[PDB]
From a paper:
The eukaryotic genome is packaged into chromatin by an approximately equal mass of histone proteins, which provide a foundation for modulating gene expression, maintaining genomic stability and regulating DNA transactions in general. Histone octamers composed of H2A, H2B, H3 and H4 core histones assemble variable expanses of ∼160–240 DNA base pairs (bp) into nucleosomes, the repeating units of chromatin. By introducing DNA annealing as a site-specific and directional driving force, cohesive-ended nucleosomes can promote self-assembly into well-ordered lattices with a variety of possible configurations.
Indeed, incompatible termini could be introduced to suppress intramolecular annealing (as occurs in the 353e and 354f crystals).
Residue numbers in the entry:
A (entry chain F): 21 to 102
B (entry chain C): 13 to 119
C (entry chain E), G (entry chain A): 38 to 135
D (entry chain D): 30 to 125
E (entry chain H): 29 to 125
F (entry chain G): 13 to 118
H (entry chain B): 23 to 102
């Protein structure tokens, strides 16, 4: 019902990420640039994940699909069934 | 009898379970008998090393249970372990405190 | 009137968030995104709550990783503000793009 | 009568209690130690798997592992992992 | 004993070169490179398929486990096509009996 | 009589040698009869798709015989092939001519 | 006499070496280095001519790819010269050093 | 000996020129010599491990291919 959710990654949330980043000062143009890179990254992982879901004739995406996806993408996550 | 092989290797890690994972994982046709030993040995040793450093992480922090963050602080602060876990995200692990000098105020 | 000088809170804000580990994106928003993005690949999907969380951990870790690479590029150009050009440069040298 | 999902968590406890007998570990943190072992399992079982394939061998021996472990593990972590590895095979063959 | 027998792909690279550019040839190093290239993408697809099957507790790499390996390893258009040519080849072979 | 499966699939790529490399590769216990087909298919296709562009690259340099640089030129200029071969070094293939604008004079 | 202005020989030296593929390190020097570095890990080793050239074909590919990244960093600093603090930034973002 | 200096200034400059580098600080030359050595050391290490494990006293192209593939620097046109 809200077809453009990329926005829900709110400026403050991105600021905080950037803080953990160790960033002191943030150009305004960033947020959108970030939102975009986020979108790509999620898009890429979730594609591979759903591939894995679909390959197992499941209608439900599992935590393991997301790990198999993150491992392929070279982006390996510990603590969900690794 | 009923002696376990871990028991003969003097390992907590299951020399049993490992030998079976090797065969059923499609790594090779035949698995040596020394192999699921030498492996468990190394998987145990590395398990120790991480829990050794992380267990000290949890002292410093005045905590009794190890949380991920102790693992993060353990791994990232050791040069070798960090090379090894180079491409490894550690859920709920966060980042080592670091602030670049040029960003600090001069006073 | 009492106010802190530009980039003083910022620095505190760093120390705060580098000491902690909690996900910094409000969870519902993030979840909604993920499903919006899942539509693009298969209609009427469903997600294990742990899957959704396994992503957010991944994304948040990536972004925080980028901004560190990003922030060293800003600093490389004797700056302190991070700018799209910096991310662009970082992704470039990483291999995320041409 | 639920699936029956194994893990390594009981061995992590066992080794936690050897090295820090007074300390413990959260679900999340075990979850991580679990991923860690499977990760460096697969990593070694692979490089060994290759080594064999590359030398037209059908059998992964301890020799393969020792090479895998030299290849995958850094300077000092490698020297020790080989040693505890060597040590454990030696202890096992003598034992019985 | 004349020597041992190093197989290759080089005869299938030619056969395809001539189908695609009958007037064009290919240096030794370049055949070299195209060999490395078949070997590399071989493993890659076999691997992702090996794991695919593992993950879903299958003993058997079917065509499906190739197709899905390929959908995963190849970019958009190169995968659409690889899936097509490979689906084509299977349907044919099957209706040859 | 006898007929090479490759024939029965319409492929130049040796469906048989694939089926064998699969079993002796340790990718699984069991290999469907379709698998080595579909694979040889997909290896052939990408082999062609490179050679197509690399053959073109040779004609552009007035050459009958494809050298490595043709392959390099072919791959690096095809966005997709370039992606797929992202971490791959092509021997004796040098680099696409690129010179960043701000370095050019006047 | 006549002489070309600082840079215009370089730009050419670029065009030349981009359009070509000959290996740009002297073959024998490199090979001695390889055996120097190999004695470390085991003495009285032997190499197939090809195996040396396989290494030399990589080292050169790598260094070339690095300088590319290096140069984009130097340029990021509104410079034209490459300097060590450009390599090091590339290699950090690449993930070769800490 | 110390064959690292055998990677003369003009050869590094040559590589940089393929890299598309217009101007080259004098420091670079020794730095490059450092990064090169790391790279050779790392590859050669794993290469010679692959040799030793086959028990050969001769390093093959396939040793070096296998290494480069491990090291994430896959090479075409020497086998494998
Ligand atoms: Cl054995
Ligand atoms: Cl099949």
């Amino acid at each position: 019902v809200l077809r453009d959710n990329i926005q829900g990654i709110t400026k403050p949330a991105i600021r905080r990420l950037a803080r953990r980043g160790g960033v002191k000062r943030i150009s305004g143009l960033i947020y959108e640039e970030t939102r975009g890179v986020l979108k790509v990254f999620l898009e890429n992982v979730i594609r591979d994940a759903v591939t894995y879901t679909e390959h197992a004739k499941r209608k439900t995406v599992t935590a393991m699909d997301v790990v198999y996806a993150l491992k392929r993408q070279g982006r390996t996550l510990y603590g969900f069934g690794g | 009898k009923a002696k376990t092989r871990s028991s003969r290797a003097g390992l907590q890690f299951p020399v049993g379970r490992v030998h079976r994972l090797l065969r059923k994982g499609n790594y090779s046709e035949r698995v040596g008998a020394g192999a699921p030993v030498y492996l468990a040995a190394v998987l145990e040793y590395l398990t120790a090393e991480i829990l050794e450093l992380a267990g000290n992480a949890a002292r410093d922090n005045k905590k009794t249970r190890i949380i991920p963050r102790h693992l993060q602080l353990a791994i990232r602060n050791d040069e070798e372990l960090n090379k090894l876990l180079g491409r490894v995200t550690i859920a709920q692990g966060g980042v080592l405190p670091n602030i670049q000098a040029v960003l600090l105020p001069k006073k | 009137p009492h106010r802190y000088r530009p980039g003083t809170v910022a620095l505190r804000e760093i120390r705060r968030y580098q000491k902690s580990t909690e996900l910094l994106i409000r969870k519902l928003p993030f979840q909604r995104l993920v499903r919006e993005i899942a539509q693009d690949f298969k209609t009427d999907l469903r997600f294990q709550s742990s899957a959704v969380m396994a992503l957010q951990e991944a994304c948040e870790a990536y972004l925080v990783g980028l901004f560190e690479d990003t922030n060293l590029c800003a600093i490389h150009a004797k700056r302190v503000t991070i700018m799209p050009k910096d991310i662009q440069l970082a992704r470039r040298i990483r291999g995320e793009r041409a | 009568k639920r699936s029956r999902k194994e893990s390594y968590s009981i061995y992590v406890y066992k080794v936690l209690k050897q090295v820090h007998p007074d300390t413990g570990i959260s679900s999340k943190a075990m979850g991580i130690m679990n991923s860690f072992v499977n990760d460096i399992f697969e990593r070694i079982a692979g490089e060994a798997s290759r080594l064999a394939h590359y030398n037209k061998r059908s059998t992964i021996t301890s020799r393969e592992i020792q090479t895998a472990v030299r290849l995958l593990l850094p300077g000092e972590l490698a020297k020790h992992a080989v040693s505890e590895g060597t040590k454990a095979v030696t202890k096992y063959t003598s034992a019985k």
